[PDB]
Design a protein around this ligand. Structure first.
Ligand SMILES: C[C@H]1CCC[C@@H](O)CCC/C=C/c2cc(O)cc(O)c2C(=O)O1
Ligand SMILES: C[C@H]1CCC[C@@H](O)CCC/C=C/c2cc(O)cc(O)c2C(=O)O1
Lengths: 264, 264
């Protein structure tokens, strides 16, 4: 049985969150699009292995749109981490395993480094350390041009699985539609330079498990593989690209449970 | 002005080879398809920066087909390295910079490790260390089914640049046509286990520059990036996939000259 609900935190944000299962806490942090329905079926798979899984739309996105501006503009890993800690403090989640892709990856590494007592282990996927002008330059467009470009780009190029992507349904795509512009203005100039992956030695020996998309062109996250390997951090692949939880839910879910079981 | 000619070596092979320019010796080893016309425009670009560039069709391939069976069956990095040292002995090339992709890559690191006095520096691109069953399984097909599958796969998927690939013209494709089956039977079962990258400390300090294709899916040569980074070996990207010398000749040529200039 899944809890769908809202909870507010004292940084002015009102989160939409979902939660299923009983057991140690596993937290699924979204990618930059901030949309926790992407996790829907995996929240169930993971929970069925004896975990309490929590997830939530991110600030300014989807149903967590009631949030002050600082929370979705000039977004950094360190800002996102403190926001996620706040929603963990409100839900009374003390010790959590965390997953995140893209800005979620940057977020979970910042969580692991900043709050080591709170984080049992962190799985980061495709952490973005580089400025990409093709993304950054969308920010100057008209809102509705941004949605068209970005929606089309997710569907045709980088979903990892276009059928799975489309099957999320009209409601999700209508929420994503509104998110694309806020993401485009808030995230890609300031997320990469916040990457908390420049201090190698802070990573060494930490409970961190890094992945990258198997179908993703080698250039996009080449740097993650170098960095993980220099730091001694476990690094491997998942199928698909940026959204293994949409394209390959079963393998995703299994990966999260297995990795969590390593650290209990 | 370019020399186009043949020379025979005492291991039974008669090589077709081309050679242009004056300067330090740069040697372009083909990928598995064995076809040195892929390097045409680059042989000129590199030479024009003051090098003597040599290239050649590989044994059993294209115009170097007059060769005994051991030279194109159960092919190995160590065999290919022996064969190229022979054609370098016959052409009186004593010190050479070498490039090679795929089986060429394996060949040039075997060359660097086995004949250190002969090799000024080696550039390896996408060195294959894994058995792939989809390639290995083509070997049991009818010759002409192998050509159709592999030619289609190069043109549609994996060329890095489909226009450039097709622009090599009818003669080269009619030679590749005959090579595909020889390659399929000779190379993919035995090249990966010969990968001379299992001794990390043999690679450390060596004059080796490793690249991978930028557009190539991350899974294919994930392992190269790990292995390079563990060995302290310089590792970067080129544009396209397995054939940067076809898809991106200008940036390929510049990369070979620039890297060679680092080691004079
Ligand atoms: C929302 C996803 C979209 C992936 C598109 C994908 O094709 C582009 C992948 C590289 C960029 C990801 C990204 C980079 C940033 O600087 C900040 C981010 O929040 C993201 C990120 O979350 O990317
Ligand atoms: C000729 C290219 C095939 C390109 C398809 C290419 O997309 C196939 C994936 C990479 C494999 C390359 C390869 C693997 C081997 O075990 C032996 C080889 O000689 C090659 C090789 O040279 O690869």
């Amino acid at each position: 049985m899944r809890t769908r609900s809202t909870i507010s935190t004292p940084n002015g944000i009102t989160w939409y969150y979902e939660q299923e299962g009983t057991g140690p806490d596993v937290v699924l942090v979204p990618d930059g699009l901030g949309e926790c329905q992407m996790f829907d079926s995996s929240v169930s798979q993971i929970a069925a292995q004896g975990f309490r899984v929590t997830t939530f739309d991110m600030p300014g996105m989807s149903r967590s749109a009631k949030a002050p501006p600082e929370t979705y503009t000039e977004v950094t890993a360190q800002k996102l981490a403190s926001y996620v800690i706040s929603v963990l403090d409100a839900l009374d989640i003390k010790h959590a395993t965390v997953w995140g892709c893209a800005s979620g990856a940057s977020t979970v590494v910042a969580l692991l480094l900043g709050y080591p007592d709170r984080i049992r282990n962190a799985m980061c996927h495709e952490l973005p350390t580089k400025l990409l002008d093709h993304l950054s330059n969308t920010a100057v467009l008209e809102d509705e041009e941004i949605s068209k470009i970005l929606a089309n780009h997710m569907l045709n190029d980088v979903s990892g699985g276009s059928e799975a992507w489309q099957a999320m349904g009209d409601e999700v795509h209508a929420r994503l539609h509104k998110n694309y512009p806020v993401w485009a203005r808030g995230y890609p100039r300031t997320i990469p330079p916040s990457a908390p992956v420049k201090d190698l030695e802070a990573l060494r020996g930490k409970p961190l498990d890094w992945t990258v998309g198997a179908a993703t062109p080698t250039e996009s996250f080449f740097d993650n593989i170098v960095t993980a390997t220099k730091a001694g951090v476990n690094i491997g692949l998942l199928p698909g690209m940026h959204f293994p939880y949409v394209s390959h839910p079963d393998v995703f879910a299994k990966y999260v449970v297995e990795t969590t079981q390593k650290h209990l």
